[PDB]
Amino acid sequence: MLQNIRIVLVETSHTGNMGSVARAMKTMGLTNLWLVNPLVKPAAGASDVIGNAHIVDTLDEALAGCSLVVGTSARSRTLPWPMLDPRECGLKSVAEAANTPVALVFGRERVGLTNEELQKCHYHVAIAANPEYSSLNLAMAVQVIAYEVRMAWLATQENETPYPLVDDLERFYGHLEQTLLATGFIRENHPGQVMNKLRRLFTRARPESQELNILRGILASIEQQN
Amino acid sequence: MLQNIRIVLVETSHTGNMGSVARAMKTMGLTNLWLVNPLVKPDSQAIALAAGASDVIGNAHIVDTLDEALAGCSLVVGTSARSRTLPWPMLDPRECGLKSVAEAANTPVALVFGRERVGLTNEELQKCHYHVAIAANPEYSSLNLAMAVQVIAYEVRMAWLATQTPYPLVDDLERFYGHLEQTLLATGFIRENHPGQVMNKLRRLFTRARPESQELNILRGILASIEQ
Ligand SMILES: Nc1ncnc2c1ncn2[C@@H]1O[C@H](CSCC[C@H](N)C(=O)O)[C@@H](O)[C@H]1O
């Protein structure tokens, strides 16, 4: 359901952009706006969407609670990542929004999302723009994504069981870390690079709740070896 | 071809919208901009204007009537959030993309957009062979001009792009499952002569992830550190 689909805006800084994003959302029937650390402070027509915008300081807080995280980027600035086109994105998002919150993440005008931020997404979506001019304006990008989302949703209004939330996955990663510290595989005050490798892997696998359960079972059993 | 797709703006009232529309075009590979009686004068040489937008505006055709904008086009499609007064046939934006690209292969095509606030008159919509409504929120169904152009141009580019493998490491993945089973046996998480259920769940999990050899090396390293 459309109310479960979050438009997440990271550190947006041009005050007109927020209004444009809000109008785009509303026209597509989206309403659930999240602002990660806005450099401009909350003048348009879709006032409601912005008045009811969640604000948070960090990206993690916009993501915890979602089962599906999708980041947007014109080009890759990470190792190979699972990719969706905007159509596929719309389908997958509408499919999961029935039960759980979905985060569609958008970066800053001019500089976009960082590598670090992009690594907290389960999928990357690149709109297939003209290669010489492949960056759309933030609000435009939202328009495209939201339009595909509405297509998919409309299709469902044409007459399974949830995924773990980012929260659960994070608990599993904590458990994984402590296990690796225990066995000595990673060191005290590790820079988090091995953990990032493993997160890349499991993000691509995208564990279901029972799979996650089994994994933590295994971790638990290992720790009783010491 | 994309240069044969005419974006036609009738009587644009805010500049800023002209820049935005120009940028939407450029990012989707469109360049053929037509202005019918702009109620504004597009600057072009502004530094504020994005990349590619300036050239699209500078090379725009400026005419006095819609008919000139439609001259030489076999296919004319107009846009409107809703047009119940008229019995004109509808396309959704996807169909419009397809139909436009097929035609633009050989003949100019016009995609027409209206004034902000009031859109196109019914006389002007009557000059279009088809109408496209972007399916929207029934309560809030009018897109911003530039956003409507963006959507239509996106579907056009998708339609145009349309006109332009076994997992290699199965053996290694197997070796990994073998060692994984030995580890699970050694920690007691599975028992001798297990019916292979936990293992199967694990294999579904890891196999759909299509592990890279790097990742298999890390996983193996972890298994090895456990025994220690
Ligand atoms: N071609 C494209 N595909 C997917 N998202 C895009 C996009 N162009 C712009 N966006 C969205 O709009 C925001 C501002 S564009 C920022 C610069 C850079 N082109 C980038 O996307 O990474 C981006 O962070 C992204 O969320």
Ligand SMILES: Nc1ncnc2c1ncn2[C@@H]1O[C@H](CSCC[C@H](N)C(=O)O)[C@@H](O)[C@H]1O
């Ligand atoms: N949902 C939608 N479908 C098709 N075109 C739209 C649209 N929303 C806005 N537009 C375009 O943007 C222009 C200005 S918006 C003006 C709103 C007007 N009520 C109308 O749609 O006709 C319109 O002329 C139209 O070309």
